[PDB]
Design an enzyme around this catalytic site. Structure first.
Site, PDB file in Angstrom:
ATOM      1  CG  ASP A   1       6.912   5.538   5.250  1.00 43.57           C
ATOM      2  OD1 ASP A   1       8.037   4.999   5.211  1.00 43.57           O
ATOM      3  OD2 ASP A   1       6.341   6.010   4.243  1.00 43.57           O
TER       4      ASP A   1
ATOM      5  CG  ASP B   1       9.551   7.951   6.220  1.00 43.18           C
ATOM      6  OD1 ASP B   1      10.479   8.138   5.399  1.00 43.18           O
ATOM      7  OD2 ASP B   1       8.360   8.248   5.993  1.00 43.18           O
TER       8      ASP B   1
ATOM      9  CB  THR C   1       0.105   3.054 -13.170  1.00 41.05           C
ATOM     10  OG1 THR C   1       0.980   3.442 -12.102  1.00 41.05           O
ATOM     11  CG2 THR C   1       0.658   3.588 -14.489  1.00 41.05           C
TER      12      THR C   1
ATOM     13  NE  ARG D   1       1.549   2.543  -7.610  1.00 42.73           N
ATOM     14  CZ  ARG D   1       0.359   3.089  -7.845  1.00 42.73           C
ATOM     15  NH1 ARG D   1       0.152   3.778  -8.957  1.00 42.73           N
ATOM     16  NH2 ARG D   1      -0.625   2.949  -6.970  1.00 42.73           N
TER      17      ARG D   1
HETATM   18  O1  U5P Z   1       1.111   1.212   6.008  1.00 45.24           O
HETATM   19  C1  U5P Z   1       1.997   0.998   5.174  1.00 45.24           C
HETATM   20  C2  U5P Z   1       1.702   0.444   3.892  1.00 45.24           C
HETATM   21  C3  U5P Z   1       2.763   0.248   3.042  1.00 45.24           C
HETATM   22  N1  U5P Z   1       3.977   0.530   3.329  1.00 45.24           N
HETATM   23  C4  U5P Z   1       5.101   0.272   2.323  1.00 45.24           C
HETATM   24  O2  U5P Z   1       4.687   0.779   1.041  1.00 45.24           O
HETATM   25  C5  U5P Z   1       4.989  -0.251   0.001  1.00 45.24           C
HETATM   26  C6  U5P Z   1       3.761  -0.440  -0.774  1.00 45.24           C
HETATM   27  O3  U5P Z   1       3.002  -1.595  -0.350  1.00 45.24           O
HETATM   28  P1  U5P Z   1       1.671  -1.924  -1.108  1.00 45.24           P
HETATM   29  O4  U5P Z   1       0.725  -0.759  -0.918  1.00 45.24           O
HETATM   30  O5  U5P Z   1       2.085  -2.128  -2.555  1.00 45.24           O
HETATM   31  O6  U5P Z   1       1.117  -3.193  -0.502  1.00 45.24           O
HETATM   32  C7  U5P Z   1       5.627  -1.438   0.641  1.00 45.24           C
HETATM   33  O7  U5P Z   1       7.085  -1.408   0.452  1.00 45.24           O
HETATM   34  C8  U5P Z   1       5.414  -1.221   2.187  1.00 45.24           C
HETATM   35  O8  U5P Z   1       6.437  -1.583   3.022  1.00 45.24           O
HETATM   36  C9  U5P Z   1       4.332   1.076   4.561  1.00 45.24           C
HETATM   37  O9  U5P Z   1       5.593   1.371   4.861  1.00 45.24           O
HETATM   38  N2  U5P Z   1       3.308   1.300   5.476  1.00 45.24           N
END
Ligand code: U5P
Ligand code: U5P
Lengths: 208, 208
Positions: free
Chosen positions: B199, B202, B107, B103
């Site tokens: 998360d 984690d 962006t 990332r």
């Molecule tokens: O509540 C959340 C939202 C996203 N993700 C993680 O963050 C990344 C980003 O997802 P996205 O925001 O692009 O849909 C993905 O790998 C997803 O597993 C989490 O662990 N928890």
């Protein structure tokens, strides 16, 4: 009662190799265990849900958990043990009870011989398991065995069943549902299901 | 495309403890793996069947086997690996490919960064897996990554998804179906699904 056929393509696939005469004892054993776990999934689709309130790391939430009920898995010696651990994978809490049956010289039906069950019998729902439902003889004796101890929820599950055996169970116990993976066509003079899979016990243990 | 919600009471049950903030990393890890295998069962209910002719120890027979097709499981680093082995239990033949995304500072979307796939790409159907579908950012980048290599069958599967993320995928790729275990309500300013589960990474690795 009603008979439920589990036609999932994975079950169907594994069933084929289970039947094949060339599948050795080790594969057989392992394949049955797998088809056992797969059917356990299909059968437990009923489990009642109760909704509690949890709290995730982000906020509170309303989720669901399994109703809370006691389960009993009972294999019919001996080929019955081949499908227990497979089911126990999904329901580790369920208790395991066994049932032995003997057969006398000039008789047409098996008979209760050895019975060991968990003490909370009256309470929990049971699932009697046996690879083959042939004449229905062993199944009926087994259910009679459980009803006599006062379990009021009994389900039967097997891989392959013959029409006669299904009918035998319907007749003797209409309050018991049946879960099978395949309904073959008939029995032969020796009591084997056709096409079936031969002697479940020998294929499983690889011994007498 | 269409989104499929797997509401099996066992999934619902395990999902609840997966969300609960008090579930430690070890249980989390193990619970996700389980819900993964369970969803693998539901999703593979499609597999085409072809019928062969085997021969049991009792007689010949007409059975069925799985059509014969190549499968690909691709986790999105890093929380994606938490659902691979669970799926591999049912489909050990499927090949495993990975996809990393980076990332940049100013962006709004992730971008292909690391890609390793099995060479038969053009041929096999793929299932991209990731615990969470939030903004749909990571999912879209991942599918763009596969389409660019010429895989013409792509399915996405996750535990929890947010409306926005589902919409993001629909819009960007209408030819991809989505398989989720639960559809939560929204995202918060930091991009977490609400109520969600925090998360995924984690909770899985217990580390950064
Ligand atoms: O509540 C959340 C939202 C996203 N993700 C993680 O963050 C990344 C980003 O997802 P996205 O925001 O692009 O849909 C993905 O790998 C997803 O597993 C989490 O662990 N928890
Ligand atoms: O083709 C068959 C028929 C029956 N049995 C076994 O023989 C017992 C007798 O079943 P039944 O004839 O009482 O139905 C059961 O334990 C069953 O597993 C087999 O192994 N193969």
């Amino acid at each position: 009662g009603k008979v439920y056929v589990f036609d999932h393509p994975l079950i169907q696939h594994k069933l084929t190799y289970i039947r094949d005469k060339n599948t050795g004892t080790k594969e057989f054993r392992e394949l049955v265990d797998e088809v056992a776990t797969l059917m356990a999934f299909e059968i437990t689709r009923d489990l009642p849900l109760e909704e509690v309130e949890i709290e995730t790391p982000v906020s509170k939430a309303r989720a669901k958990v399994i109703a809370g009920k006691k389960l009993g898995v009972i294999p019919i010696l001996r080929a019955g043990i081949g499908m227990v651990d497979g089911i126990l994978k999904l329901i580790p809490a369920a208790k395991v009870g066994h049932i032995g049956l003997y057969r006398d010289p000039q008789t047409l039906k098996p008979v209760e011989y050895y019975v060991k069950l968990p003490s909370d019998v009256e309470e929990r729902d049971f699932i009697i398991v046996d690879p083959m439902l042939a004449t229905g003889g062993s199944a009926v004796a087994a259910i009679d065995a459980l009803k006599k101890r006062g379990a009021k929820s009994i389900k039967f599950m097997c891989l392959i069943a013959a029409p006669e055996g299904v009918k035998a169970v319907e007749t003797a116990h209409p309050d018991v549902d049946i879960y099978i993976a395949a309904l073959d066509e008939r029995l032969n003079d020796h009591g084997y299901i056709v096409p079936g899979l031969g002697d479940a016990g020998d294929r499983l243990f690889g011994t007498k």
